[PDB]
Design an enzyme around this catalytic site. Structure first.
Site: not given
Ligand SMILES: Cc1cc2ncn([C@H]3O[C@H](COP(=O)(O)O)[C@@H](O)[C@H]3O)c2cc1C
Ligand SMILES: Cc1cc2ncn([C@H]3O[C@H](COP(=O)(O)O)[C@@H](O)[C@H]3O)c2cc1C
Lengths: 347, 347
Positions: A172, A315
């Site tokens: 995701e 991801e």
């Molecule tokens: C640059 C970046 C790349 C990412 N790849 C996955 N996430 C992860 O971070 C998010 C969930 O965390 P929260 O609930 O705290 O917002 C989702 O997009 C998850 O896939 C990412 C987040 C960031 C910033």
């Protein structure tokens, strides 16, 4: 019809599993010495889409991308646009799942199920809306929208099976998605929010209290029925969570294995198994997420991950990392020699 | 000279590790989200033989084979000849380590350091004697024999480095070898035999008492000095254990990484670190062995394996299984995109 879909999920093939176990016991090694690699091979042998034997053809990782209204509650430090930017990077092969999938020889399918931005060229378009509703004040979506997405994703998934794909990985992408994931886990397991709300993408410790508060409000306001997985998904879930659940239902219907990832994926698997218990035998854990609620979610799924990497990226990066393990169980099964062939006899 | 060898083991390159950490922090992901995969990449960057960057060239697994006099004490259910038969199968590619190494693109080097049988064509010959002495009534070998084998194996190992090998895996093959392995672990950690003696290759539960008894006798009779790793190896160890320790010393001298396997390997690593603490930074854990004394041995090495597979086969099968993980850390480092490049800024 979603009813037909759920009805037609095949049970595992006990006959193939028995033949598999017998073969594994006769390999050049003390019986049971390869532990979980042996039980994995047997699990695979029972999945009808694999043709009675542990095998891996093409591999794919499906990444569900969507934005969430709950972001406005200050539960995520990352800007909302990062969802759309990272989704774009997924098509360029520069993200973490892309690099790990390439390393495992898997293809990454990026699916937009609800990103709050203009459409991104190269991304599979299945968007329900521009971001789901803010779960803190109401539902994420209507039940009708959840069922429709489950169906479409389930179909896309089993359709890939016709392209030679035999092993899936779920993933995701969505800023703020660890919030609905925690809400769902709390509801399905009956655990308090405090025990399941993590730091997500580096949320400062001083902002956690607010996150726990938002999760409780979402539940109190929506009152999701824990015995109804779709009710829970549509009320305190998100489009990305729904998509992930849909991949699991599609693979199970197709009689094929699906590798879970981290916390977000555990949330989607709790929903999927609530909806259709027959999905369980097709799920394979990858790693043990460093997210706070991981231990509770996994205990309720009765799963013990293979990899302990303290990973928390998401991801589908964990799913990709474990693919070589699935291939290893197949190689053991098909390539090892046999005891009898060396006249070796062991009690 | 073994003294020169131990003296010339390089310390890790802190400068390359600092540059590595900076680069990893700038990748397309929240800082630290790839957890142990990030710390692994940094560890690799500090190893001088890798040229200041996480990278993997050719991979090799060295399997040390030898028989033990302690077999006569009834501590192993497998016939003694199984050592020679399996060693032969190693040259045919049908054993568990062979299949997993092929899957990881690694080559298996089978080394006879003391098999009690006629020489096996195709196997590297470095035999000290036809099986070591029965540790229950005396020493396994002389100190001179242990030091000589350490030297020869250390040289062979670093010599492979000149052939392009940058990542090693250690393994063993020898009926009854979980007995000296337990004796060594008990001595180095100060733990009672009962807490470290496992079932090895499916030893019946009713025969465990005898195994514990033999281990205690070996220690009481030989009185090995825990502060002298070579004394311990030569007294209650075995030729295979010595060989494994030699691979670790050779790789460290060469400034290259070595992947451990299971319990036997943890025993050899305790010895190697006792002999030369400078070897520690070059050791990489693979899996968490299902052997009873694994938890204690790992705690004393301060290691936390990546894989939880309930494996207990040995042969270096765990080391081969983890090689893809090492390659994954390198791929992340070299292939991921950067935040700045996408204008993404995170606290
Ligand atoms: C640059 C970046 C790349 C990412 N790849 C996955 N996430 C992860 O971070 C998010 C969930 O965390 P929260 O609930 O705290 O917002 C989702 O997009 C998850 O896939 C990412 C987040 C960031 C910033
Ligand atoms: C067919 C066979 C293949 C093996 N491959 C590794 N081991 C493992 O078993 C031995 C140690 O266990 P113990 O102390 O109980 O004898 C070693 O050879 C170890 O490599 C094997 C054992 C057998 C029988």
């Amino acid at each position: 019809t979603l009813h037909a879909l759920l009805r037609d999920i095949p049970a595992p093939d006990a006959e193939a599993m028995a033949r598999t176990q017998q073969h594994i016991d006769g390999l050049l090694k003390p019986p049971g010495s390869l532990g979980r690699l042996e039980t994995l091979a047997v699990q695979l042998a029972g999945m009808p889409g694999l043709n009675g034997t542990p095998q891996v053809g093409e591999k794919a990782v499906l990444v569900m991308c969507a934005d969430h209204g709950v972001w406005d509650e200050g539960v995520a430090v990352s800007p909302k646009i990062v969802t759309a930017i990272q989704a774009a990077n997924m098509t360029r092969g520069t993200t973490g799942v892309c690099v790990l999938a390439a390393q495992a020889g898997a293809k990454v399918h990026v699916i937009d199920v609800g990103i709050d931005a203009e459409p991104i060229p190269g991304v599979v378009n299945m968007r329900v809306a521009r971001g789901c509703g803010n779960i803190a004040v109401g539902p994420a979506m209507s039940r009708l929208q959840a069922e429709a997405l489950l169906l479409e994703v389930s179909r896309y998934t089993c359709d890939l099976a016709q392209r030679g794909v035999t092993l899936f990985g779920v993933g995701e992408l969505g800023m703020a998605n660890t919030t609905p994931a925690a809400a769902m886990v709390s509801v399905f397991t009956g655990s308090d929010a405090k025990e399941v709300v993590g730091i997500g993408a580096n949320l400062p410790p001083s902002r956690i209290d607010n996150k726990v508060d938002v999760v409780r409000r979402a539940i109190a306001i929506n009152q999701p029925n824990p015995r109804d997985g779709i009710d829970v998904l549509s009320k305190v879930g998100g489009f990305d969570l729904v998509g992930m659940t849909g991949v699991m239902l599609g693979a199970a219907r197709c009689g094929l294995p699906v590798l879970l990832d981290g916390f977000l994926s555990y949330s989607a698997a709790l929903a999927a198994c609530q909806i259709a218990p027959a999905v369980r035998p097709y799920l394979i854990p990858s790693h043990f997420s460093a997210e706070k609620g991981a231990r509770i979610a996994l205990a309720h799924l009765s799963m013990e991950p293979y990899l302990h990497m303290a990973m928390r990226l998401g991801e589908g990066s964990g799913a990709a990392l474990a693919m070589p393990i699935v291939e290893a169980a197949c190689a053991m099964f098909h390539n090892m020699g046999e005891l009898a062939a060396s006249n070796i006899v062991l009690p």
